[PDB]
PDB file of all heavy atoms in Angstrom:
ATOM      1  N   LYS Q   6     114.197 121.809 107.564  1.00  0.00           N
ATOM      2  CA  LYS Q   6     114.978 121.494 108.895  1.00  0.00           C
ATOM      3  C   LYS Q   6     114.097 121.933 110.078  1.00  0.00           C
ATOM      4  O   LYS Q   6     113.910 121.158 111.012  1.00  0.00           O
ATOM      5  CB  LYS Q   6     116.263 122.162 108.923  1.00  0.00           C
ATOM      6  CG  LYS Q   6     117.343 121.697 108.035  1.00  0.00           C
ATOM      7  CD  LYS Q   6     118.688 122.430 108.358  1.00  0.00           C
ATOM      8  CE  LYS Q   6     119.777 122.026 107.485  1.00  0.00           C
ATOM      9  NZ  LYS Q   6     120.982 122.929 107.747  1.00  0.00           N
ATOM     10  N   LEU Q   7     113.624 123.132 110.070  1.00  0.00           N
ATOM     11  CA  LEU Q   7     112.885 123.718 111.178  1.00  0.00           C
ATOM     12  C   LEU Q   7     111.624 122.982 111.417  1.00  0.00           C
ATOM     13  O   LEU Q   7     111.259 122.704 112.581  1.00  0.00           O
ATOM     14  CB  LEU Q   7     112.546 125.242 110.895  1.00  0.00           C
ATOM     15  CG  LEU Q   7     113.745 126.168 110.978  1.00  0.00           C
ATOM     16  CD1 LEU Q   7     113.391 127.611 110.473  1.00  0.00           C
ATOM     17  CD2 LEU Q   7     114.268 126.215 112.445  1.00  0.00           C
ATOM     18  N   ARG Q   8     110.864 122.611 110.349  1.00  0.00           N
ATOM     19  CA  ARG Q   8     109.627 121.875 110.519  1.00  0.00           C
ATOM     20  C   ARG Q   8     109.955 120.452 111.073  1.00  0.00           C
ATOM     21  O   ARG Q   8     109.201 119.913 111.877  1.00  0.00           O
ATOM     22  CB  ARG Q   8     108.906 121.771 109.170  1.00  0.00           C
ATOM     23  CG  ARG Q   8     107.723 120.781 109.148  1.00  0.00           C
ATOM     24  CD  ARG Q   8     106.564 121.110 110.044  1.00  0.00           C
ATOM     25  NE  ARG Q   8     105.607 120.068 110.027  1.00  0.00           N
ATOM     26  CZ  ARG Q   8     104.429 120.022 109.334  1.00  0.00           C
ATOM     27  NH1 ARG Q   8     104.053 121.121 108.685  1.00  0.00           N
ATOM     28  NH2 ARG Q   8     103.652 119.012 109.380  1.00  0.00           N
ATOM     29  N   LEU Q   9     111.060 119.797 110.613  1.00  0.00           N
ATOM     30  CA  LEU Q   9     111.419 118.519 111.138  1.00  0.00           C
ATOM     31  C   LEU Q   9     111.794 118.625 112.592  1.00  0.00           C
ATOM     32  O   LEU Q   9     111.438 117.774 113.442  1.00  0.00           O
ATOM     33  CB  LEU Q   9     112.540 117.825 110.287  1.00  0.00           C
ATOM     34  CG  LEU Q   9     112.023 117.337 108.912  1.00  0.00           C
ATOM     35  CD1 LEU Q   9     113.223 117.154 108.043  1.00  0.00           C
ATOM     36  CD2 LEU Q   9     111.275 116.027 109.100  1.00  0.00           C
ATOM     37  N   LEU Q  10     112.610 119.660 112.900  1.00  0.00           N
ATOM     38  CA  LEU Q  10     112.896 119.954 114.373  1.00  0.00           C
ATOM     39  C   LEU Q  10     111.575 120.123 115.182  1.00  0.00           C
ATOM     40  O   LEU Q  10     111.437 119.566 116.293  1.00  0.00           O
ATOM     41  CB  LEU Q  10     113.793 121.169 114.518  1.00  0.00           C
ATOM     42  CG  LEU Q  10     115.221 120.916 114.054  1.00  0.00           C
ATOM     43  CD1 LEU Q  10     116.059 122.202 114.153  1.00  0.00           C
ATOM     44  CD2 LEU Q  10     115.896 119.842 114.893  1.00  0.00           C
ATOM     45  N   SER Q  11     110.594 120.806 114.560  1.00  0.00           N
ATOM     46  CA  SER Q  11     109.419 121.051 115.230  1.00  0.00           C
ATOM     47  C   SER Q  11     108.573 119.701 115.495  1.00  0.00           C
ATOM     48  O   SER Q  11     108.008 119.471 116.578  1.00  0.00           O
ATOM     49  CB  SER Q  11     108.429 122.074 114.535  1.00  0.00           C
ATOM     50  OG  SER Q  11     107.232 122.196 115.194  1.00  0.00           O
ATOM     51  N   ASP Q  12     108.540 118.837 114.455  1.00  0.00           N
ATOM     52  CA  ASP Q  12     107.824 117.599 114.560  1.00  0.00           C
ATOM     53  C   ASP Q  12     108.452 116.677 115.615  1.00  0.00           C
ATOM     54  O   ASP Q  12     107.740 116.034 116.379  1.00  0.00           O
ATOM     55  CB  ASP Q  12     107.768 116.909 113.237  1.00  0.00           C
ATOM     56  CG  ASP Q  12     106.707 117.381 112.296  1.00  0.00           C
ATOM     57  OD1 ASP Q  12     106.240 118.465 112.406  1.00  0.00           O
ATOM     58  OD2 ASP Q  12     106.349 116.579 111.344  1.00  0.00           O
ATOM     59  N   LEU Q  13     109.741 116.761 115.705  1.00  0.00           N
ATOM     60  CA  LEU Q  13     110.461 115.926 116.676  1.00  0.00           C
ATOM     61  C   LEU Q  13     110.225 116.451 118.091  1.00  0.00           C
ATOM     62  O   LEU Q  13     109.966 115.628 119.034  1.00  0.00           O
ATOM     63  CB  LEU Q  13     112.032 115.822 116.414  1.00  0.00           C
ATOM     64  CG  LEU Q  13     112.807 115.019 117.354  1.00  0.00           C
ATOM     65  CD1 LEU Q  13     112.420 113.511 117.223  1.00  0.00           C
ATOM     66  CD2 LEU Q  13     114.341 115.139 117.022  1.00  0.00           C
ATOM     67  N   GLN Q  14     110.245 117.772 118.262  1.00  0.00           N
ATOM     68  CA  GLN Q  14     109.970 118.375 119.558  1.00  0.00           C
ATOM     69  C   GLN Q  14     108.632 118.033 120.102  1.00  0.00           C
ATOM     70  O   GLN Q  14     108.431 117.779 121.234  1.00  0.00           O
ATOM     71  CB  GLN Q  14     110.173 119.892 119.441  1.00  0.00           C
ATOM     72  CG  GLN Q  14     111.679 120.299 119.236  1.00  0.00           C
ATOM     73  CD  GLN Q  14     111.898 121.653 118.733  1.00  0.00           C
ATOM     74  OE1 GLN Q  14     112.954 121.959 118.143  1.00  0.00           O
ATOM     75  NE2 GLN Q  14     110.961 122.590 118.933  1.00  0.00           N
ATOM     76  N   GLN Q  15     107.649 118.080 119.156  1.00  0.00           N
ATOM     77  CA  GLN Q  15     106.250 117.653 119.518  1.00  0.00           C
ATOM     78  C   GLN Q  15     106.201 116.207 120.139  1.00  0.00           C
ATOM     79  O   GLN Q  15     105.592 115.920 121.157  1.00  0.00           O
ATOM     80  CB  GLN Q  15     105.288 117.773 118.385  1.00  0.00           C
ATOM     81  CG  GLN Q  15     103.861 117.396 118.699  1.00  0.00           C
ATOM     82  CD  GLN Q  15     102.961 117.225 117.437  1.00  0.00           C
ATOM     83  OE1 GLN Q  15     103.413 117.174 116.335  1.00  0.00           O
ATOM     84  NE2 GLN Q  15     101.616 117.164 117.713  1.00  0.00           N
TER      85      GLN Q  15
END
Side-chain angles (χ1 to χ4, degrees):
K6 290 184 180 173
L7 287 171
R8 171 65 186 258
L9 287 160
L10 288 175
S11 178
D12 279 24
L13 184 61
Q14 289 160 204
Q15 180 193 12

